[PDB]
Write an enzyme that holds these catalytic residues in place. Structure first.
Site, mmCIF file in Angstrom:
data_model
loop_
_atom_site.group_PDB
_atom_site.id
_atom_site.type_symbol
_atom_site.label_atom_id
_atom_site.label_comp_id
_atom_site.label_asym_id
_atom_site.label_seq_id
_atom_site.Cartn_x
_atom_site.Cartn_y
_atom_site.Cartn_z
ATOM 1 N N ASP A 163 0.669 -1.147 0.044
ATOM 2 C CA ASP A 163 -0.206 -0.081 -0.003
ATOM 3 C C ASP A 163 0.925 1.235 -0.002
ATOM 4 O OD1 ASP A 163 -2.194 1.530 -0.342
ATOM 5 O OD2 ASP A 163 -3.053 1.269 1.750
ATOM 6 N N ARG B 177 -0.178 8.990 1.115
ATOM 7 C CA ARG B 177 -1.060 8.971 2.221
ATOM 8 C C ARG B 177 -0.400 8.034 3.466
ATOM 9 N NH1 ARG B 177 -3.489 6.140 -1.666
ATOM 10 N NH2 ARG B 177 -3.637 4.051 -1.220
ATOM 11 N N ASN B 178 0.436 7.086 3.114
ATOM 12 C CA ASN B 178 0.955 6.002 3.931
ATOM 13 C C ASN B 178 2.439 6.635 4.258
ATOM 14 O OD1 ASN B 178 -1.118 4.770 4.479
ATOM 15 N ND2 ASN B 178 -0.900 3.339 2.565
ATOM 16 N N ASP C 263 2.201 4.585 8.468
ATOM 17 C CA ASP C 263 0.972 4.907 8.605
ATOM 18 C C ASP C 263 0.311 4.232 10.228
ATOM 19 O OD1 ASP C 263 -0.880 2.239 7.718
ATOM 20 O OD2 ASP C 263 0.506 2.321 6.406
HETATM 21 C C1 LIG Z 1 -5.233 -3.059 9.381
HETATM 22 C C2 LIG Z 1 -4.230 -2.715 8.654
HETATM 23 C C3 LIG Z 1 -4.181 -2.638 7.084
HETATM 24 C C4 LIG Z 1 -3.188 -2.102 6.379
HETATM 25 C C5 LIG Z 1 -1.984 -1.351 6.831
HETATM 26 N N1 LIG Z 1 -1.744 -1.454 8.274
HETATM 27 C C6 LIG Z 1 -0.960 -1.159 9.080
HETATM 28 N N2 LIG Z 1 0.501 -0.435 8.674
HETATM 29 C C7 LIG Z 1 1.358 -0.916 8.291
HETATM 30 O O1 LIG Z 1 1.782 -2.048 8.827
HETATM 31 C C8 LIG Z 1 2.559 0.033 7.390
HETATM 32 N N3 LIG Z 1 3.656 -0.173 7.612
HETATM 33 C C9 LIG Z 1 4.375 -1.014 7.073
HETATM 34 O O2 LIG Z 1 3.776 -1.758 6.225
HETATM 35 C C10 LIG Z 1 5.903 -1.144 7.257
HETATM 36 S S1 LIG Z 1 6.643 0.585 7.343
HETATM 37 C C11 LIG Z 1 5.749 0.886 8.648
HETATM 38 C C12 LIG Z 1 6.011 1.906 9.771
HETATM 39 C C13 LIG Z 1 5.143 2.322 10.791
HETATM 40 C C14 LIG Z 1 3.799 1.867 10.658
HETATM 41 C C15 LIG Z 1 3.335 1.205 9.902
HETATM 42 C C16 LIG Z 1 4.332 0.624 8.774
HETATM 43 C C17 LIG Z 1 -1.410 -1.075 10.221
HETATM 44 C C18 LIG Z 1 -0.590 -0.752 11.608
HETATM 45 C C19 LIG Z 1 -0.802 -1.525 12.732
HETATM 46 C C20 LIG Z 1 -0.365 -0.807 13.949
HETATM 47 C C21 LIG Z 1 0.513 -0.013 13.872
HETATM 48 C C22 LIG Z 1 0.712 0.790 12.695
HETATM 49 C C23 LIG Z 1 0.183 0.260 11.471
HETATM 50 N N4 LIG Z 1 -2.563 -2.063 10.454
HETATM 51 C C24 LIG Z 1 -2.929 -2.113 9.197
#
Ligand SMILES: Cc1cccn2c(NC(=O)CN3C(=O)CSc4ccccc43)c(-c3ccccc3)nc12
Length: 293
Positions: free
Chosen positions: A148, A152-153, A166
């Site tokens: 994703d 926005r992310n 995000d």
């Molecule tokens: C429910 C859901 C759907 C799609 C993405 N979701 C994320 N988001 C990521 O996992 C996005 N993400 C990376 O994929 C790795 S980089 C990185 C850094 C900090 C934060 C996130 C990150 C979460 C989520 C959960 C707890 C805390 C934060 C984020 N839940 C979701």
């Protein structure tokens, strides 16, 4: 649990920043988190539910985020699991998400502490893209696939530090950037390559396709890709091989990097290492070079 734990009393919620289906984000003071700072601001994600599904999820997401530590990944500090709601603590990024930052510094443009007045310049747009690419290099290094990647992310902090991450609420805040298929399945189709939409394959190479679309967003100051098109029309035009057109503010030099990410065949797309190196070199180039791009 290689996961750092933070005691509930060391966190004082000040107010809400944002709200989703799976949680809320607060701004908080965190005490005794860093040496140089006995008191500092953080963003706290509170889990809405706390069921069997939510809490084995939470424990996994906590492990993954503990593992991802880099200058261009949102800094994860740890969890507060002493009495609900369960909390995840993050670095506070004061300009919010890059899409909002891009829109509020667009060609229609309030300058301030971190940014000139007027539209962001070539130099600034390249330094932003370069930072996002630096985070994508680190993820691909670990063979982690985002799925994703979009402005926005990403977040923007003090000094225009841009970091990937995000709070998992982009589906709720940015419902228009998703195609709803299932009862609860939501696909970022405008950011996805043909192999992801057709064959449902997601790889490093669908991430570089998605980064090319991030580069387009950046140089259109946060416009939605294919905004003129519906969800079905955008799928048609992406699977039929149509390429987003050069943004006005985008030098040909940069439109070419965008095109290197959008080769139809995955193995032909340039590697994220190559894209970072091209954007960094541009970002660090002397004004005399940049003025004639
Ligand atoms: C429910 C859901 C759907 C799609 C993405 N979701 C994320 N988001 C990521 O996992 C996005 N993400 C990376 O994929 C790795 S980089 C990185 C850094 C900090 C934060 C996130 C990150 C979460 C989520 C959960 C707890 C805390 C934060 C984020 N839940 C979701």
């Amino acid at each position: 649990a290689c996961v750092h734990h933070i005691k509930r009393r060391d966190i004082v919620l000040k107010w809400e920043l944002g709200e989703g289906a799976f949680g809320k984000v607060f701004l908080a003071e965190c005490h005794n988190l860093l040496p140089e700072q006995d008191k500092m601001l953080v963003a706290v994600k509170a889990l809405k539910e706390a069921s069997e599904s939510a809490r084995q999820d939470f424990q996994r997401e906590a492990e993954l985020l503990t593992m991802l530590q880099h200058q261009h990944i949102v800094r994860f500090f740890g969890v507060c699991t002493e009495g609900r709601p369960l909390l995840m603590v993050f670095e506070y990024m004061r300009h919010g998400d890059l899409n909002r930052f891009l829109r509020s510094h667009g060609p229609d443009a309030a300058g301030g502490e971190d940014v000139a007045p007027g539209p962001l310049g070539l130099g600034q747009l390249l330094a932003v893209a370069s930072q996002v690419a630096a985070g994508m290099v680190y993820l691909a290094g670990l063979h982690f696939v985002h799925r994703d990647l979009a402005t926005r992310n990403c977040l923007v902090g003090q000094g225009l530090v841009v970091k990937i991450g995000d709070f998992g609420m982009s589906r709720d805040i940015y419902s228009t950037d998703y195609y709803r298929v299932g009862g609860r399945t939501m696909l970022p189709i405008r950011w996805m390559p043909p192999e992801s939409i057709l064959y449902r394959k997601f790889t490093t190479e669908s991430d570089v396709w998605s980064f090319g679309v991030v580069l387009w967003e950046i140089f259109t100051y946060g416009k939605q890709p294919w905004y003129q098109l519906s969800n079905t029309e955008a799928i048609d035009c992406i699977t039929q091989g149509r390429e987003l057109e050069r943004p006005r503010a985008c030098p040909p030099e940069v439109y070419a990097i965008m095109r290197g990410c959008w080769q139809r065949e995955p193995q032909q797309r340039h590697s994220i290492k190559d894209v970072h190196a091209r954007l960094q070199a541009l970002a660090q180039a002397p004004p005399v070079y940049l003025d004639v791009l």
